[PDB]
């Protein structure tokens, strides 16, 4: 049972890292289960998702919350809709492998990238 927590953009960073207000606090994010290998245009993508949202989400997944670097891993959702997902199905990323049991979206975005990939989108093109 994973909780979506409101959020506020403070800057984008790039296609799987974004620095948001976090309960009052400021915090880098960096998106789960999307590697980045079209570096500019997820980018862009991203960028453009989080800036023009009017309700930005976190959403932690049941494994480790934060990576070494101390970024949070999770879910951003932008409007309702999953930003890691659209990425993927947009075919600006592939889906990295599970990361301290982060999983519960795997599956889900697997099927994304596999009609990406059918679609010889961007990164599959």
Request: charged share 45%; no cysteine.
């Given at each position: 049972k994973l909780h979506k927590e409101p959020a506020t953009?403070?800057?984008a960073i790039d296609g799987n890292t974004v620095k948001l207000m976090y309960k009052g606090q400021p915090m880098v994010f960096r998106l789960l289960l999307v590697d980045i290998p079209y570096g500019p245009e997820a980018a862009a993508f991203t960028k453009k998702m989080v800036e023009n949202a009017?309700?930005?989400e976190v959403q932690f997944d049941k494994g480790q919350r934060t990576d070494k670097?101390?970024?949070g891993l999770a879910y951003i959702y932008a409007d309702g809709k999953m930003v890691n997902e659209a990425l993927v199905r947009q075919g600006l990323a592939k889906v990295a492998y599970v990361y301290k049991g982060n999983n519960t979206h795997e599956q889900h975005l697997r099927k994304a990238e596999a009609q990406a990939k059918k679609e010889k989108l961007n990164i599959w093109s």
């Open positions: 953009l403070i800057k009017k309700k930005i670097y101390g970024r």
